[PDB]
Design a binder for this molecule. Sequence first.
Ligand SMILES: [Mn+2]
Ligand SMILES: [Mn+2]
Ligand SMILES: [Mn+2]
Ligand SMILES: [Mn+2]
Ligand SMILES: [Mn+2]
Ligand SMILES: [Mn+2]
Ligand SMILES: [Mn+2]
Ligand SMILES: [Mn+2]
Ligand SMILES: [Mn+2]
Ligand SMILES: [Mn+2]
Ligand SMILES: [Mn+2]
Ligand SMILES: [Mn+2]
Lengths: 156, 156, 155, 155, 155, 155, 155, 155, 156, 155, 155, 155
Amino acid sequence: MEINIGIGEQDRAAIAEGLSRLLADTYTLYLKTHNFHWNVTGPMFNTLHLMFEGQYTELAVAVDDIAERIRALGFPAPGTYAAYARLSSIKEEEGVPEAEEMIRQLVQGQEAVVRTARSIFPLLDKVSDEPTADLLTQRMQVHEKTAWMLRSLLAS
Amino acid sequence: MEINIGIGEQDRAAIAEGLSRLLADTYTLYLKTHNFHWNVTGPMFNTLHLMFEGQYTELAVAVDDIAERIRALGFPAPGTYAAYARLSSIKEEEGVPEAEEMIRQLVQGQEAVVRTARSIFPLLDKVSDEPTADLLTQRMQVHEKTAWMLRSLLAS
Amino acid sequence: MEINIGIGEQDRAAIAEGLSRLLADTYTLYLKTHNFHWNVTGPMFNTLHLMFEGQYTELAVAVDDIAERIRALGFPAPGTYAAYARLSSIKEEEGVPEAEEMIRQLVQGQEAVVRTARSIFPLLDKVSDEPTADLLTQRMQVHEKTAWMLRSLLA
Amino acid sequence: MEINIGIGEQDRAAIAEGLSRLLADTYTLYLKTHNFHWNVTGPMFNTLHLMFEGQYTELAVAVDDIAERIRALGFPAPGTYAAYARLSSIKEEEGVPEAEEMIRQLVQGQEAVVRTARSIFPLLDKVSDEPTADLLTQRMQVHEKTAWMLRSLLA
Amino acid sequence: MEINIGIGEQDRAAIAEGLSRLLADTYTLYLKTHNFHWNVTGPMFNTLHLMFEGQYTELAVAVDDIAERIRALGFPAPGTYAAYARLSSIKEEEGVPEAEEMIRQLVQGQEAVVRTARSIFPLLDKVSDEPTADLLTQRMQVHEKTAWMLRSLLA
Amino acid sequence: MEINIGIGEQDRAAIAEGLSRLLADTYTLYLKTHNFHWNVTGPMFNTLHLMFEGQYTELAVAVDDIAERIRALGFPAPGTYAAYARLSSIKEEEGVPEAEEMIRQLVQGQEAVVRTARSIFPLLDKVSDEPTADLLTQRMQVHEKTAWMLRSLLA
Amino acid sequence: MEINIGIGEQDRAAIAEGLSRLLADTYTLYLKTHNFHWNVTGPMFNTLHLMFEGQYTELAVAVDDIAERIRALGFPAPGTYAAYARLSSIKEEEGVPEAEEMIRQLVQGQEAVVRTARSIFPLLDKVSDEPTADLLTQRMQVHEKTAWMLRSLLA
Amino acid sequence: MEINIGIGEQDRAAIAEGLSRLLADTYTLYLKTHNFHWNVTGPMFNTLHLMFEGQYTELAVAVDDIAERIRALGFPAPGTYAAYARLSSIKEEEGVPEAEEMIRQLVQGQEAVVRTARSIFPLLDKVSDEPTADLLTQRMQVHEKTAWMLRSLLA
Amino acid sequence: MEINIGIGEQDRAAIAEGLSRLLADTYTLYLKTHNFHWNVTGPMFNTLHLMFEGQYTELAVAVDDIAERIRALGFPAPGTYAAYARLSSIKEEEGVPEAEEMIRQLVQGQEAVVRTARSIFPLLDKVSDEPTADLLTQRMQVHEKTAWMLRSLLAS
Amino acid sequence: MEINIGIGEQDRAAIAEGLSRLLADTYTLYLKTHNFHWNVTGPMFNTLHLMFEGQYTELAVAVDDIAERIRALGFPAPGTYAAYARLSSIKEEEGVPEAEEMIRQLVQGQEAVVRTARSIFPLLDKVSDEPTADLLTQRMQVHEKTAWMLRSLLA
Amino acid sequence: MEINIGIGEQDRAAIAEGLSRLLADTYTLYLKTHNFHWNVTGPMFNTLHLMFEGQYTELAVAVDDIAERIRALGFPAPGTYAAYARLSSIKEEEGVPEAEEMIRQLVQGQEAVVRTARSIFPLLDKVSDEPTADLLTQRMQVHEKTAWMLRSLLA
Amino acid sequence: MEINIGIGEQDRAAIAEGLSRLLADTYTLYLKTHNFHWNVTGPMFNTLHLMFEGQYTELAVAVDDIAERIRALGFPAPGTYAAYARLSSIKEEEGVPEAEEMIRQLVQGQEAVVRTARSIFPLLDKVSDEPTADLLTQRMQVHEKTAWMLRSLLA
Ligand SMILES: [Mn+2]
Ligand SMILES: [Mn+2]
Ligand SMILES: [Mn+2]
Ligand SMILES: [Mn+2]
Ligand SMILES: [Mn+2]
Ligand SMILES: [Mn+2]
Ligand SMILES: [Mn+2]
Ligand SMILES: [Mn+2]
Ligand SMILES: [Mn+2]
Ligand SMILES: [Mn+2]
Ligand SMILES: [Mn+2]
Ligand SMILES: [Mn+2]
């Protein structure tokens, strides 16, 4: 059945392309957070195990909301290692860094996602897509909050 | 007691007029969806009965939220058959269509509400009512997501 | 599939027609109650706002149970403004009455549903349909209780 | 301790006999519904696996409610394969029907129990046993609704 | 405001009177079960302390439902020691019986409520007060069930 | 088994006697509150019906707790219309006052229970019984709270 | 679709056959427990009525789990009076035994399931069906624990 | 660690300054609402006690949400009587006014927070901070809705 | 309508006055703890953010309980910045201290409330206002427990 | 950091010593209640297994609250076999008594702990330690109630 | 701190290696299931969207359990696209297959995890790592059960 | 009543001996963890007070499960300081060590329970006591997981 939601097909394709990078970034940050949840050690173990658990649990929900916005725009949601490797601007950590470096990478991850969200608004303006803009706004809120909580641990 | 929320009375009345049409369209969709929930048959009965139940439940809450924004703006919320028939842009189904045609009508219903929501933004531009804009954006989000779920059923 | 529940076709039809009137009254009362829930003002705002909330919430469940009794009997459940306007015995209010007039209208609404339910028992006796008689009994219980709470506000 | 609930011992024995057949039909339908839940296949697996689970779960409670009404009347509740095979009017399915034949057998199961329940209201009439009449009424409402949901799948 | 629930004023007055006696017997049984919950002793303490708890908990709700049916009919609900002793047909226990005698009195108490309930159905036949008839049926069902559970301890 | 809790038989018996007046006042206030819940009318119906419900709900748990302190002290908990009408200092109301008068009686009822609890303290300040002292404290806290909420309605 | 879970058709068939006996014993025990739950009398009514409720509630879940393991192995799950009566090793009880004999039979029921469970293990080692082995293990744990709680009543 | 969220430091300081006045007005209204909750009296006591309780509970969460947006922007959240008295645009009530005047001041208070929220938007246009805009929008929605509920009490 | 709860006006007023001071210390500690919850940083961010959250949540309920005892005694409960500044004995912190100083101040705050509570008892002994006595006793138990948990963090 | 709760070190060390015996009694009773829960047999198995479970569950919480009041006072909490063995006035039971004797020993235990509670109140008076006085008062309330329920089994 | 759990470093490392492949397969099945949840269309949208939701939700918990078992063995858990792609035996789908093909791949994906689980058991036998054995057993049980439900949709 | 679960009395007694040791190690760890929960200090207070709370809460449930496995085997469960101190292989700590030494001891407690569980397995091979093997497996899984979390804190 044809889609008549007030946005033409190529404009929807462009928004979906942006949301696909956002999904890729969000999912890469999900897996990294999950990874650090399992692997962190040192005297901060209990606090960071729990903190990273709260984060990966939140991100798992965010990946589902982003992917379904893509579907609501009429396009397939990417969901493979190859697609996420290709589309993600966040780099993965292949080793087991010290707790402090883990916190530092996650701060940078939050901020990388904010960057990707900001990059999509020029498009939404010209095309007019308030739901997508509200989605990006919610992700920016969560990641900026999460970044304050993470960097606060590094404060002198 | 005089209302001092930063919007003049005739501008509030224009917004309320717009939200009254959105409320009638949402209410008409609610009862149609409820109707189809009762009356659908065929091998998709269990899945459509449940699916339309989720939708009518969500719309029941949406009708209350839209009505209460009208009240927040200092105007009465319409709430009769005659007001909704007059204000709605969606047509009712008096008979019992096939399940496929139920699904198609509900897809068109989602899209009709999105169009009514959009028609209110030019007003909100000129006037400046962020809460109402957030409400329209939420309804657009729900209806565009529901449209994807409904139209997926028809894919061949 | 054939319907073999011990009630014949014309009989089920006549019961369904009675329940359609009850559904139409119940649904009209639901919307009137929803409407007064939004629009009531005055010093009783908070209690009436909340009380009309409990009522429309209960009525929304009752509409689903009446509708689905109609379906168990083998007939489509009506569900449009036109069908309810034709079938319904409750006069609609297009303005915003004072709080005490809203209460009276709702009392009269409760009693209209009861009057419609009572209107169906003569048929049910003849026909024998204990589930529908029990549905009508449950609705009469609710509407009579709700009528006492409403009219109590007017004393 | 003697039982003085306003119904004599042989009248209670007779109500217990009717309830014992109702219990055997309800229990046979419970096990068949449980069987079909486990064994149904095809594209309707997810929807029927779930639907038959709602039904068999509802029926486990019904068996306990019927059986304890028999106890309330002063009589033992039957509860063996042999007892239920003897009292049941519902035929058993020893194989694995296609999904549609499962839906159809279960519609007829619903209508069988309603038949058994209807057969009992004469007696309860004569001896004015209002609890047992309410129990039969609730079982009929359930099975008639279920039969509509089942048969809707075959339309 | 006028009461127009389809039952004239004199008929409601008489049903209200029946229910007032049902309420007094239910409340009296309520306070006796409560009394025995506190006061039972012996090797059955745990079983009966808990069993009598479930019973008074249930009856507390029963008294509220009965009283509000009276209110729905347009009449004040009695609720003093003096009204209940006058209206009650159950006699209270001023002492502290042995466990077995507590059980026997509670059994008898269940059957006394069932009796007061049956006393009422005649007033309902004339006017088809189905809500009240369902209320009585539910109380009869609860007390007949509880009688079985209590009397079972004496076998 | 002998009760060895560091309070002597006569002293316990004197506490039981005081707690028994507390129970009688609490139970009499419970039933008065219940009564007024059912019977209040007027524009404040919703607020008072709900307010009195919360009050009566809380006292029912309190009667159980007062009564079980008496049993902990080795004595029977009173539980009859006669025994409460004797011990209670709450004048019962046999008719249906105006809502404002219901509120006043209920205020006085809170104060009555506190007056009784206070009367029991001399006895406690000669015997060492911290649990009974804490129970009296909890009741006074609740009834003084309740009295403020009640009297506020009258300002 | 072919089944490739690492066990070949014949072995899956042999394991499903043992699980079918386990299902039958478990289901028969379920019904006998359900039966004794309804039918026990005497001083221990309250305690055995609840104890047998807990057990049959657990066994109803167990029948589902065993049946679905049979489906996971690729075979249909038996589910008729005739099929359980043939496969079961538990003797049914058509009467109403005394409370202690009900306990005694339910003890022996637990031990017959264990016996059946143990008979299946030789087969599983051969093919290393670990999920089936864990299933048997959990049922044995539950039945051994229930046995202890039941026989404790007879010490 | 450097803050790289796409907003410069002085731009963040200006947003934080605006949000610090939003926080001060929100906290001042929280406390005023809490105060009126404790202190209101008259026949509306029950409904305003509860309504003001809904409001202060919601505002308590709002104060935490606003303060943590400030922290997300990299600045300290104000949290003293002196800081809030300096930054607040809302005056406190030091006495105990009549219920109507309490309602009037809470209306004025809702509308004061809306004006403060509105005042911050020009900054967010120029700078680009969508999260803060969404926070402002949610506060505006809550206070405008609450203003309707409150002022409806005065119609 | 009169108040006859076995205590006279002049005595209730004296108790209300002492509970007014308790309310003011409890609120000032409430606000201080909330402040530290938002504002604490360092490697202990997570544990202290969470710990101060539990405390400010508890204290919010205590202020409601103290305030309504005053009301039960027949007097208006104070609730303004100025009323609490005047009546309170806790020193407010206008800055953002290091985490260890935040802990130390919150210990002192616990003890300050206890000190205020002890000072009221004499006045209850005369008239046997047992409810107020039990209220004080409960606050003392919470604050002394909270003080132990706080000071255990400083131990070396 | 220094402790300044209005109670000097010597007085706090004396209270700790008392609470340390109360804790060793409470714990010893906790393990003994726990032990009898596992090991009781006979026809009261179900009722006592469940009664002892409720009791030990309660005692496990009480041990934590006693230990942590000892930390609030500024002293370590004992927590080993040797410490509890040294401090406990509760005699341990190394075999498996019969149910009646288990009931007896647990009644003794409730009363032993009440006795230790009482022994500490003089200190608390001297120094005014109201929190610890309320802890003891709560233990005594629970143990005196529990003893009533246990000894009731022996009547 | 040294790891002394009865298994040496080299053996723990070999098991960790095996569990790393189990993690990779399980995470790959996780993401594919998640993908088919978003992307499936056609008449089965509603049932498959929900079924795949239940599956991916269960696998999210499973990956956490397998990861933490590797950590309990003393080794890092892998957690990157490259590491999972290297270790996984499941082939990713880069397109959007038809619903039936999605079902078919999810069946094979269930069977591939079982295949990997089986391959690990020898290394466990030679050292008596019973917790890892039980983890593998639980995964096989979930996956064989899920394969039955999936393949049933294709009959 | 004889015990017939497939294991001889000599064998069941030997298994109950192994589990008595396990029960003793588990209770000893339980109390030590509970002790450290109360007594730990320093900058890790909040994290370790919480972590040790979760651990003792879990071990308290574990002791009940191990005790009741012994009762399922037909032997009494030990439960006194002297029985546990005799059987326990875990050396207690009578002082208050530094937080890090508390962690290290709790690591060794975990591994000591694992050591005792492993000693028991042979005796279960000879006999096929599957429930007991699974209980040990579960305990091993919990302790080896808790060990990783605890030793992680020391990295
Ligand atoms: Mn989803
Ligand atoms: Mn609403
Ligand atoms: Mn429905
Ligand atoms: Mn039952
Ligand atoms: Mn009521
Ligand atoms: Mn009780
Ligand atoms: Mn199932
Ligand atoms: Mn916060
Ligand atoms: Mn409050
Ligand atoms: Mn603790
Ligand atoms: Mn985890
Ligand atoms: Mn246990």
